[PDB]
Amino acid sequence: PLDLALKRKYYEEVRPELIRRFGYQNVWEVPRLEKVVINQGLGEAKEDARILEKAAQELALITGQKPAVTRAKKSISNFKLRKGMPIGLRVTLRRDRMWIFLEKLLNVALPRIRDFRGLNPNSFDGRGNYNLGLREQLIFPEITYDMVDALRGMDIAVVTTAETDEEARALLELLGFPFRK
């Protein structure tokens, strides 16, 4: 389904707002979202491979995309890990399904958070990408109450043709991100 608000938001709204703000010279040099990665630090489900399926299928309806995993390379002896075996969920979303995830983020995910305050502005990686943490993934639409067996956490990532955080800062505000000033 190639169409949505954020599909056009970036275009008939953000496209020229940037050309004014920074003034490019070519249609491509303009900062674009193009890669949303979603991650999970599930060292917890080290034991239960069952709870592995839940964070995965939940991820399915929230990310609107099939989920994937990744076991470690040199695993922490101390915290119950050793070699190739463990677990760390990961699911890169691109094209349009990326958008349809984002629309749920700044218009549903954020507005109903336990005392959400604003996306920490320091979260820019010096270059043009963003990373931010969430505790409850039940703030997502499809997730019902009597269904979650535990508060599994995770953290999202969004890659941008941005070359500096200023340029990224502007490009996320313009698409619609509730920054903590």
């Binding site: 169409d3 549903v108 507005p111 109903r112 499809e142």
Partner: peptide, 30 residues
């Protein structure tokens, strides 16, 4: 499919996703 967000506070966004019956509340409209 066309996912309607009848978020409780006064609004109904026809977005895309799963299940057109998306009951919500306290979104961006409030």
């Amino acid at each position: 499919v066309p996912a309607r967000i009848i978020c409780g506070c006064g609004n109904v966004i026809e977005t895309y996703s799963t299940k057109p019956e998306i009951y919500v509340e306290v979104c961006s409209k409030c």
